[PDB]
């Protein structure tokens with residue numbers, strides 16, 4: 001059998017930059033920051049003072065209150081974003097095509113807020129007052145579960161959990177499902193609602209978070225004075241579709257997914273391998289998968305978390321893979337604006353990568369004020385660039401040494 | 414534009430289960446109808462309606478690693494690392510700098526480090542966030558089993574963690590199977606791990622009435638029995654080494670069997686309740702049969718999901734009839750959860766191992782504890798006693814919350 005071509009036919013998102021794709025994207029290409037003071041928890045207890053939160057998100061605008069009450073925020077975001085994506089796709093999921101429409105959405109930690117609140121009930125009211133809905137509300141695969149129920153999607157059904165690589169791995173895995181002919185449509189991406197007491201406690205404890213109290217400068221990928229990531233929340237979901245299936249229904253096509261790379265550092269639980277060698281290998285695997293030369297890559301949407309090690313090592317990995325071309329292509333980290341959505345990062349960044357191609361605009365890295373000699377590539381500082389793009393690469397890396405890369409291409413017949 | 418299709422064989426097995434702290438012990442107990450269920454000891458069960466569980470017996474992690482290393486791993490990760498090392502040793506696989514990028518790891522867990530989360534959050538509440546460990550986040554996340562296995566083995570290839578509730582172990586193995594099939598790794602260390610015997614897990618599964626409240630360990634787990642009343646929770650890890658065939662042959666590997674089919678569907682029905690008549694499960698079995706390119710009649714033995722809840726065993730029986738027709742009464746079905754309890758995310762891992770060994774050894778493990786026939790569950794559940802038989806194809810089912818259905822098909826290797 002021949003490999004199927006896989007195109008992107010719908011986009012859905014909730015992010016700190018907007019409660020839909022258009023607003024999120026429009027804010028991104030105008031260098032708008034989604035970072036502000038923490039409100040979701042009490043910032044007094046942590047060295048971190050800022051976060052990238054959804055603004056003005058009222059879940060009841062999208063579903064009944066009683067339905068939302070049986071969903072952790074991570075699931076709420078996923079269901080809202082998935083429905084948005086399917087509506088954008090104008091896909092009618094009938095009984096006839098339901099077994100060929102699947103869902104592959106990941107989350108890095110799933111319903112942590114629900115776990116915390118229920119454990120507190122356990123401690124104060126006793127185990128017999130834990131909710132009958134606790135288990136399904138907490139497990140990370142309930143985003144996929146609830147999405148499939150909301151959509152009537154009966155096909156291949158999964159959830160990848162790979163830390164900060166989650167959103168990228170999930171999309172790549174869905175891509176492979178369609179390539180091998182096991183689904184015609186996959187609703188896929190990542191979702192995360194990690195703004196909780198234990199998440200702030202945990203990422204403070206290992207010094208991962210920026211302790212910069214100024215929301216204007218906290219997230220500054222590649223900057224000499226970067227000091228950690230700024231945590232965000234949301235979901236980025238796309239509809240992937242087999243090409244002939246898309247054409248036959250007159251689907252709109254944003255672009256094509258053509259390459260996916262997955263490697264492991266096998267080095268350390270949290271620290272990236274020296275020189276970003278594992279990330280270099282993942283990019284090389286994605287490039288070989290797409291059947292292109294490295295020079296064909298026009299823009300890299302970096303993982304670019306604003307930690308010391310990540311941005312330095314990702315720069316090294318890019319130089320290793322692209323050689324002289326590393327100084328010719330454009331790189332940017334949109335985490336400068338959205339913050340780090342953890343398991344949802346790969347999802348929103350896939351959306352930005354796809355729209356960069358569709359609209360011919362490279363979103364900038366904001367907040368670079370002090371150049372770092374070790375991070376000397378072209379990070380598209382401050383201002384978006386209008387440019388025709390043919391190929392875009394997006395990286396995600398995670399704890400556990402996960403490296404994941406996707407390559408997107410401008411759709412040509 | 415060519416779609417690569419490699420053959421994928423099983424070259425190593427490793428396990429910790431309530432039936433033993435290795436594969437040989439677990440397997441020999443299974444074919445002898447031995448129960449791994451007893452009183453709960455891991456937590457104080459006075460405040461839960463459930464009184465029995467399937468725990469590892471005499472598992473001391475310090476027998477496998479230094480205490481200092483164990484203290485940086487949640488039990489779910491301990492089990493995964495120990496089982497994975499056993500699987501790689503069984504495979505006699507030497508991972509070097511040279512083949513490292515072609516060796517990957519795909520181990521799932523349903524919930525990951527829940528005990529760590531409970532203990533660290535109680536510390537947060539009682540002592541404050543400064544007392545939360547720098548190791549809390551990596552210790553808790555489900556993919557740390559894959560991460561720690563990767564680090565221990567030096568495996569640098571395709572790397573992932575599927576989390577699909579009670580389908581987790583089966584999905585993980587199928588996903589690893591597809592990686593090798595499409596040419597993206599030569600070896601995958603894959604399976605499921607779970608350490609769900611915790612205060613919140615017992616509280617949660619009591620609150621939704623999933624657990625059996627039967628206080629008698631002799632009858633608590635009784636899949637397909639008229640008086641079944643919920644599952645008995647267990648723990649452990651089942652890990653296997655999948656390998657591309659020519660690679661396995663080149664290094665002189667021993668081959669237990671071949672993986673040939675994988676089916677994944679969603680009910681799209683309810684967050685916890687299975688779809689009417691197990692229709693989604695039937696579709697997953699049908700997809701796996703199609704993937705394997707065989708007729709339903711070629712299946713000799715089904716290792717059922719068989720959790721001992723009313724609805725699972727009833728609907729799984731219906732699904733089997735739907736898929737196999739008259740052949741449903743000709744093949745053998747059994748649930749080894751009658752002996753192991755329900756290992757949740759690790760269930761598909763240990764059950765994959767039992768399915769593979771059933772083929773290699775030509776022995777079908779029984780369903781124990783069936784005393785009262787249920788008119789609705791009237792298939793051949795291989796009751797009480799193992800059955801010696803030459804098997805060519807075995808199918809293993811898993812189903813989970815979120816409406817996940819996953820099926821694997823294994824084949825005898827020439």
Ligand SMILES: C/C=C/C/C=C/CCC(=O)[C@H]1O[C@H]1C(N)=O
Pocket residue numbers: 108109163164165194199208305342343397398399550554
């Ligand atoms: C509370 C956890 C939510 C999801 C967890 C993600 C793992 C942490 C990461 O991978 C982030 O450390 C950042 C990175 N390596 O990009």
Ligand SMILES: C/C=C/C/C=C/CCC(=O)[C@H]1O[C@H]1C(N)=O
Pocket residue numbers: 135139523524578579580609613614617623720757758812813814
């Ligand atoms: C609290 C621990 C969660 C880890 C595993 C969750 C799986 C939930 C399920 O799918 C189980 O209900 C059993 C089943 N459907 O077989």
Ligand SMILES: [K+]
Pocket residue numbers: 207208209210211227228
């Ligand atoms: K920091």
Ligand SMILES: [K+]
Pocket residue numbers: 301302303346349394395396
């Ligand atoms: K990226």
Ligand SMILES: [K+]
Pocket residue numbers: 622623624625626642643644
């Ligand atoms: K029950």
Ligand SMILES: [K+]
Pocket residue numbers: 716717718761764809810811
């Ligand atoms: K099974």
